[PDB]
Amino acid sequence: ENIEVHMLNKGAEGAMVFEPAYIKANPGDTVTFIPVDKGHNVESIKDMIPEGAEKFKSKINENYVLTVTQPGAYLVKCTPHYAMGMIALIAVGDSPANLDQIVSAKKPKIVQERLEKVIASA
């Protein structure tokens, strides 16, 4: 199964967002990041991907297809815009073992607010 994600300068949540910012997936699913607006990419945040997942980072403005294998939570950011709160949370499988850790991890305040919201909403 594939889930399309748009990288936008403006969305329901404000400036610099991923839509959806919450992706529920299963091992083997693919997540396609589409740069609706230019200037975006997708990058795994260090220590915010599950044990054993491979780190990734797409090139600015390219359509990136992520294959998710390892269950757990993945916090991804848009490199240039992370500080402006551009992140998405990918939850692979049930009860991501590393979700409390990601929630607790050091990250920008805006990031934290958006994270809390996406999670609250799931």
mmCIF file of C-alpha atoms in Angstrom:
data_model
loop_
_atom_site.group_PDB
_atom_site.id
_atom_site.type_symbol
_atom_site.label_atom_id
_atom_site.label_comp_id
_atom_site.label_asym_id
_atom_site.label_seq_id
_atom_site.Cartn_x
_atom_site.Cartn_y
_atom_site.Cartn_z
ATOM 1 C CA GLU A 1 0.000 0.000 0.000
ATOM 2 C CA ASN A 2 1.108 3.545 -0.897
ATOM 3 C CA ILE A 3 0.366 6.773 0.924
ATOM 4 C CA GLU A 4 0.917 10.102 -0.830
ATOM 5 C CA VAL A 5 2.277 12.994 1.230
ATOM 6 C CA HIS A 6 2.438 16.581 -0.014
ATOM 7 C CA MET A 7 5.239 18.967 0.904
ATOM 8 C CA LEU A 8 3.693 22.438 1.018
ATOM 9 C CA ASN A 9 4.653 25.971 1.909
ATOM 10 C CA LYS A 10 1.216 26.488 3.403
ATOM 11 C CA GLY A 11 -1.446 24.014 4.559
ATOM 12 C CA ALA A 12 -4.165 23.551 7.134
ATOM 13 C CA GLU A 13 -1.635 23.685 9.966
ATOM 14 C CA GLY A 14 0.117 26.784 8.646
ATOM 15 C CA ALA A 15 3.426 27.301 6.945
ATOM 16 C CA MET A 16 5.820 24.589 5.883
ATOM 17 C CA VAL A 17 3.836 21.412 6.344
ATOM 18 C CA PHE A 18 3.619 17.805 5.324
ATOM 19 C CA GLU A 19 0.002 16.717 4.532
ATOM 20 C CA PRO A 20 -0.765 14.327 6.095
ATOM 21 C CA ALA A 21 1.707 14.873 8.961
ATOM 22 C CA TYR A 22 0.593 11.549 10.468
ATOM 23 C CA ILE A 23 1.097 8.451 8.377
ATOM 24 C CA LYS A 24 -0.097 5.051 9.593
ATOM 25 C CA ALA A 25 1.755 2.330 7.647
ATOM 26 C CA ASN A 26 2.666 -1.337 7.686
ATOM 27 C CA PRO A 27 5.953 -3.045 6.954
ATOM 28 C CA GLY A 28 6.324 -3.126 3.179
ATOM 29 C CA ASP A 29 4.179 -0.015 2.555
ATOM 30 C CA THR A 30 5.608 2.910 0.586
ATOM 31 C CA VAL A 31 5.262 6.583 1.460
ATOM 32 C CA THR A 32 5.501 8.915 -1.513
ATOM 33 C CA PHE A 33 6.553 12.448 -0.676
ATOM 34 C CA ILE A 34 5.426 14.900 -3.354
ATOM 35 C CA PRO A 35 6.964 18.368 -3.482
ATOM 36 C CA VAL A 36 3.817 20.300 -4.306
ATOM 37 C CA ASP A 37 5.810 23.441 -3.566
ATOM 38 C CA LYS A 38 9.516 23.640 -4.340
ATOM 39 C CA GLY A 39 12.189 23.922 -1.699
ATOM 40 C CA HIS A 40 11.285 20.746 0.212
ATOM 41 C CA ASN A 41 12.829 17.341 0.791
ATOM 42 C CA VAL A 42 12.389 14.604 3.410
ATOM 43 C CA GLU A 43 15.006 13.457 5.868
ATOM 44 C CA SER A 44 14.890 10.994 8.752
ATOM 45 C CA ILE A 45 15.692 12.734 12.064
ATOM 46 C CA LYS A 46 18.647 11.244 13.939
ATOM 47 C CA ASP A 47 17.587 8.934 16.779
ATOM 48 C CA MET A 48 13.982 9.414 15.722
ATOM 49 C CA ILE A 49 13.611 6.352 13.491
ATOM 50 C CA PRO A 50 13.295 2.784 14.863
ATOM 51 C CA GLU A 51 16.213 0.590 15.816
ATOM 52 C CA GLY A 52 17.445 -0.898 12.525
ATOM 53 C CA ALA A 53 15.693 1.376 10.071
ATOM 54 C CA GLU A 54 18.002 2.980 7.546
ATOM 55 C CA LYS A 55 18.445 6.759 7.610
ATOM 56 C CA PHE A 56 17.199 8.552 4.463
ATOM 57 C CA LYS A 57 17.296 11.947 2.893
ATOM 58 C CA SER A 58 15.796 12.955 -0.419
ATOM 59 C CA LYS A 59 17.053 15.732 -2.649
ATOM 60 C CA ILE A 60 15.244 19.101 -2.609
ATOM 61 C CA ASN A 61 12.265 19.100 -5.012
ATOM 62 C CA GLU A 62 12.396 15.409 -5.879
ATOM 63 C CA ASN A 63 9.580 12.914 -5.541
ATOM 64 C CA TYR A 64 10.845 10.520 -2.862
ATOM 65 C CA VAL A 65 9.436 7.036 -2.398
ATOM 66 C CA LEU A 66 10.141 5.686 1.063
ATOM 67 C CA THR A 67 9.758 1.924 1.639
ATOM 68 C CA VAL A 68 8.972 1.282 5.322
ATOM 69 C CA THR A 69 10.114 -2.014 6.778
ATOM 70 C CA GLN A 70 10.825 -1.698 10.487
ATOM 71 C CA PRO A 71 7.877 -1.179 12.822
ATOM 72 C CA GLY A 72 8.017 1.807 15.190
ATOM 73 C CA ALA A 73 7.712 5.553 14.810
ATOM 74 C CA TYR A 74 9.677 7.664 12.411
ATOM 75 C CA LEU A 75 9.926 11.432 12.786
ATOM 76 C CA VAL A 76 10.872 12.962 9.435
ATOM 77 C CA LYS A 77 11.632 16.569 8.688
ATOM 78 C CA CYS A 78 11.957 18.771 5.696
ATOM 79 C CA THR A 79 15.691 19.740 5.983
ATOM 80 C CA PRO A 80 15.479 23.471 5.237
ATOM 81 C CA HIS A 81 12.217 23.912 7.124
ATOM 82 C CA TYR A 82 12.515 21.682 10.231
ATOM 83 C CA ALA A 83 12.888 24.748 12.472
ATOM 84 C CA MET A 84 9.649 26.147 11.045
ATOM 85 C CA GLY A 85 8.024 22.909 12.107
ATOM 86 C CA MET A 86 7.964 20.870 8.948
ATOM 87 C CA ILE A 87 7.779 17.283 10.130
ATOM 88 C CA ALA A 88 5.691 14.157 9.661
ATOM 89 C CA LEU A 89 5.297 11.187 11.948
ATOM 90 C CA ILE A 90 5.168 7.763 10.308
ATOM 91 C CA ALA A 91 3.770 5.043 12.596
ATOM 92 C CA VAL A 92 4.599 1.554 11.306
ATOM 93 C CA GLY A 93 2.657 -1.200 12.996
ATOM 94 C CA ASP A 94 0.918 -1.112 16.309
ATOM 95 C CA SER A 95 2.128 0.546 19.515
ATOM 96 C CA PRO A 96 5.390 1.986 18.163
ATOM 97 C CA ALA A 97 7.854 1.113 20.899
ATOM 98 C CA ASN A 98 9.831 4.323 20.362
ATOM 99 C CA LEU A 99 6.972 6.806 20.260
ATOM 100 C CA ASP A 100 7.316 8.036 23.902
ATOM 101 C CA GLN A 101 11.044 8.558 23.296
ATOM 102 C CA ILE A 102 10.458 10.625 20.104
ATOM 103 C CA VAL A 103 7.830 12.696 21.987
ATOM 104 C CA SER A 104 10.391 13.361 24.704
ATOM 105 C CA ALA A 105 13.389 14.039 22.475
ATOM 106 C CA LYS A 106 15.024 17.420 22.095
ATOM 107 C CA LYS A 107 13.454 19.280 19.096
ATOM 108 C CA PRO A 108 12.299 22.827 18.151
ATOM 109 C CA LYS A 109 9.308 24.109 20.132
ATOM 110 C CA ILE A 110 7.241 24.504 16.995
ATOM 111 C CA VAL A 111 8.182 21.014 15.975
ATOM 112 C CA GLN A 112 7.081 19.802 19.402
ATOM 113 C CA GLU A 113 3.732 21.591 19.078
ATOM 114 C CA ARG A 114 3.030 20.120 15.704
ATOM 115 C CA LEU A 115 4.115 16.692 16.940
ATOM 116 C CA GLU A 116 1.769 16.866 19.911
ATOM 117 C CA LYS A 117 -1.069 17.904 17.706
ATOM 118 C CA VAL A 118 -0.617 15.140 15.103
ATOM 119 C CA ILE A 119 -0.380 12.627 17.909
ATOM 120 C CA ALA A 120 -3.338 14.025 19.847
ATOM 121 C CA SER A 121 -5.389 13.668 16.690
ATOM 122 C CA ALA A 122 -4.430 9.963 16.212
#
